[PDB]
Symmetry: D2
């Protein structure tokens, strides 16, 4: 699975379950073209994002819907969302895990890039 | 100063100097209009950012050019930038600090909202 | 696995490999008693630390030898190490993942605690 | 001020005010000897922790009472405290800021080592 998104909850100290996540790919004309969509699972993971789809070289945007998540939990968050924009597969095929750690007024995002 | 941006470098243990930062307010036709812009100083800070009487209520995106910053030092970072998107001044004026802490493959962002 | 430790390297974007980890449980007399120990694997993980029914209620301290890790890559770090001290299982025994993300001048730690 | 200590709350998005910080130095015999101590202020900062005519080369430990901070707010946190341990002024004179960013189940810490 070459694109994996994992989200944790730093207030509850757990997986962030059912977070909307939309991946996009910057097309040849400089506009973001949908690429994959998802809701995180019981373990805060979102798998098979390139099933049926080519994971080609390019610029990707993983957009995590943190506002909905915190609002569904009765909290008013600071951010509308958490976006992670990066170039994929520029030096060859890689496997990517984007981890997001969440609080209402704060997030962190790391990328684990491993060579297949 | 009602909107400050502050940047640290987690690798070197110091402020992040000369980091380009571009702020945009979302326009009603639902697109991002230039709002202000600048470079962090010697203390990693950016002040006097709000273009005249313009810091109205609205959706803001602060974009930090972290890629140029790591590339100026010879490092090859994960991200193209770090965008922070938030609604500002919807329930009466506050002062906003956007703190960003930077690593080549990771960053962290926090809003410290305080009351006039 | 009821006590697990994940370390990640935020400079390189990968698991932190071969990092020395030492757990301790606080004793009857309020001193720290050697409990388990390990070095993180290829995936930056350290497994079979506790042994389920060997994991009592108490205060544990996970220490991560972050200093050697950075000096073994030719970097000179800030911290001597990173410690994590938590109360374990004071309730209906649960699984603990302690995740640590590393950088020379900074680290961040998170607990994922799940009902088995 | 050769040793500042700044604490932010990532849940509420404000400084963490009134936080108990206790600082130790490792003595000749390798036991932690009390050194300075205090409580963070309206800005979450803790100034006047030490005097440059007294802050000598050695290993310090900066312990921050996150548990009482979270309880005082009705929150059952994960960690007992946040311990930051580090060697100081071994290369001569420098200013140190320990920044800590708190969530009930996570925290991150960065050292900003700047020069006289």
């Amino acid at each position: 699975c070459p694109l994996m998104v994992k989200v944790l909850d730093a207030v509850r100290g757990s997986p962030a379950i059912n977070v909307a996540v939309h991946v996009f790919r910057k097309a040849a004309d400089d506009t973001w073209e949908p690429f994959a969509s998802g809701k995180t699972s019981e373990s805060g993971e979102l798998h098979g994002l390139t099933a049926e789809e080519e994971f080609v070289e390019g610029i990707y945007k993983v957009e995590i819907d943190t506002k909905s998540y915190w609002k569904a939990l009765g909290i008013s968050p600071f951010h509308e969302h958490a976006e992670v924009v990066f170039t994929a597969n520029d030096s060859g095929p890689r496997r990517y895990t984007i981890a997001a750690l969440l609080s209402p007024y704060s997030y962190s995002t790391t990328a684990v890039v491993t060579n297949p």
